[PDB]
Amino acid sequence: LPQGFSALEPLVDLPIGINITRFQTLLALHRSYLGWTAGAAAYYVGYLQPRTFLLKYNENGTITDAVDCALDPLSETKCTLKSFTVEKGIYQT
Amino acid sequence: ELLHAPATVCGKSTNLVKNKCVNFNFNGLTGTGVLTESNKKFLPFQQF
Secondary structure (H helix, E strand, O other), X not given: OOOOOOOOOOOOOOOOOOOOOOOXXXXXXXXOOOXXXXXXXXXXXXXXXXXXXXXXXXXXXXXXXXXXXXXXXXXXXXXXXXXOOOOOOOOOO | OOOOOOOXXXXXXXXXXXXXXXXEEEOOEEEEEXXXXXXXXXXXXXXX
16 A cells, blocks of 8 residues: 555546445456456455544645544644644543 | 435536626526636535
């Protein structure tokens, strides 16, 4: 996994009225005709939860930074103050 | 069919003027003002 920050853009939207509960990841592999060989898949799986985020926009309209408002007290202080830099003091959160 | 899914079957666009106080309807957004050409740049998936 990299050590940078990249944002995701909406690729496709679809109108679908069906109910969805499970997904199955299709996989095809090289046929050496010796015929499918061994596999070396390297795909990762994660899941989403409701969270509150604070995002930063530049002059070209792209996203440069973000902060999660519930990770540690400093993040919540930044979330309450509505800023990215703070000074010394005591704050009520 | 009875409307149980989002509606998709249905289906004007008068001319365009600029630099004067006019009423505008841009895809459902209604308002009044003065229309002038700008120099801002949009990413190619943003409407307004």
